[PDB]
Amino acid sequence: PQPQYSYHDINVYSLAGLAPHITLNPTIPLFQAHPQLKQCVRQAIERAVQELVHPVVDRSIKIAMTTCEQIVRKDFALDSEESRMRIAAHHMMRNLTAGMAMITCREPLLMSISTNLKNSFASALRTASPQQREMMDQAAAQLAQDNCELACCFIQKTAVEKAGPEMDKRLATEFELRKHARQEGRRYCDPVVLTYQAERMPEQIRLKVGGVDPKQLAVYEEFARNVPGFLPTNDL
Amino acid sequence: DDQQLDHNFKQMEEHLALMVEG
């Protein structure tokens, strides 16, 4: 399965960013007999996102926060340029936060979208025939399957946009160490890491004092290029 | 393709059989 949406297709500012992307299959039988039920589809999808966006964002960021912090501090302990460290941290933090938001919301979204559509359909028909209830269940299941990826991308991007400042807060002291060292006219080097690399690591895989080789940055560049749930920004 | 998955699957079964007991 390929993702339909690139990261810049979905406007997160408001829930109204969903409406231009809602897939509404025209062969759904419930709408063949009751076209007036098309209208409550948007509010049900918006409602299902509204009740899950905040809890998923907080959990997805919480899970990826410590992991990205510790691995980035470790990888850039002998790099005096907080510019590279901050860019790499965001590439990984957004990538892992988007992944954890995907795992967390895909199943509850299918459930929530289906449930909200069933209640909106039932409140519009009130007393419904068991034949009409089969229509509402099939429509709710079809619409949830057809819009789960959109709602998932909305929550993912929301979590990604919030991970920016959160990752900066976690790396505040690491940024200040490199900024304070530059003002004293010297590069920053973690003393514990510098000792270990110099004393215990083999030459071919040792961390280099003079920054990091740009070709070894391929990992963090891939984090920004290939985000789970979205189309890759470029090829290769 | 499918042979290597089966080969790796049998090895994990052997590995987990020793781990859970020993």
Partner: protein
């Protein structure tokens, strides 16, 4: 001498883990040498971007989890990465930092999959093998980490609905946690925690009476026996213990299982007033 030229191949592969154009071959070769190179784990951890690349191989199969589409090639590739992560989790020089980075948290989604295909089963077992390697160290920080990351609810789902091997590995993990004093006190701390564990163990006894499994029965009994060491858990077991453990339901299957018979006999004596 001759072994030094082989270490240069190890170094080149670790460096090739960074670029995605050379990662798959480097994952394959390094997983094969993870048994013959004792210091491979510190080299993997302290090199640049290596652990980040392994986390990348994990997150990149998240879209394949839901809907379940994980192919055989994807499962083989990501399990080569999980193999190297297991190498890092086992080594005493990298185990603490492995847990400090909360790396197992990104294997938890795999333990949540329910697909019965072999790519998904091989994924769950490999992931379970990583957690198994952790508890086999009998380290206090491994128990404290697992108690606080909510892996017990994940094991209970596998213990109730997984395959026969998956149930046994998950039960073994819960057993190792329970064997540690802190794990027993944590699960018996509130009735909400204990009751949820005892109900799952109860359902497994019914399943075992229909579909028998010697090794699964052995570790289900060990869990019950360990729970009986706690006073609050001992009182509840006297009214909720499955009758199939007190009668002769598992008499023929346990005929040649000396240790399980001993554990089961000690269990029934512990519950006696």
């Amino acid at each position: 001498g001759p072994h030094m030229l082989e270490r240069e191949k190890i170094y080149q592969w670790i460096n090739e883990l960074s670029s995605p154009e050379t990662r798959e071959n480097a994952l394959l070769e390094l997983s094969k040498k993870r048994e013959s190179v004792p210091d491979l784990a510190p080299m993997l951890w302290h090199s640049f971007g290596t652990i980040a690349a392994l986390l990348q191989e994990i997150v990149n199969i998240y879209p394949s989890i839901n809907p379940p589409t994980l192919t055989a090639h994807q499962s083989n590739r990501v399990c080569n990465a999980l193999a190297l992560l297991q190498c890092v989790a086992s080594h005493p020089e990298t185990r603490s930092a492995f847990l400090a980075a909360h790396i197992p948290l990104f294997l938890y989604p795999f333990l949540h999959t329910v697909s019965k295909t072999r790519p998904f089963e091989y994924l769950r077992l490999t992931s379970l093998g990583v957690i198994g390697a952790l508890v086999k160290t009998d380290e206090q920080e491994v128990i404290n980490f697992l108690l606080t990351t909510e892996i017990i609810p994940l094991c209970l789902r596998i213990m109730e609905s997984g395959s026969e091997l998956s149930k046994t590995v998950a039960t073994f993990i819960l057993q190792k946690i329970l064997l540690d004093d802190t794990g027993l006190a944590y699960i018996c701390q509130t009735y909400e925690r204990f009751s949820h564990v005892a109900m799952i163990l109860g359902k497994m006894v019914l399943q075992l009476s229909k579909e028998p499994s010697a090794r699964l029965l052995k570790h289900v009994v060990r869990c019950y026996l360990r729970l009986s060491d706690n006073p609050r858990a001992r009182e509840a077991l006297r009214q909720c213990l499955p009758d199939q453990l007190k009668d002769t339901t598992f008499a023929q299957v346990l005929k040649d299982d000396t240790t399980t018979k001993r554990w089961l006999a000690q269990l029934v004596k512990n519950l006696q007033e």
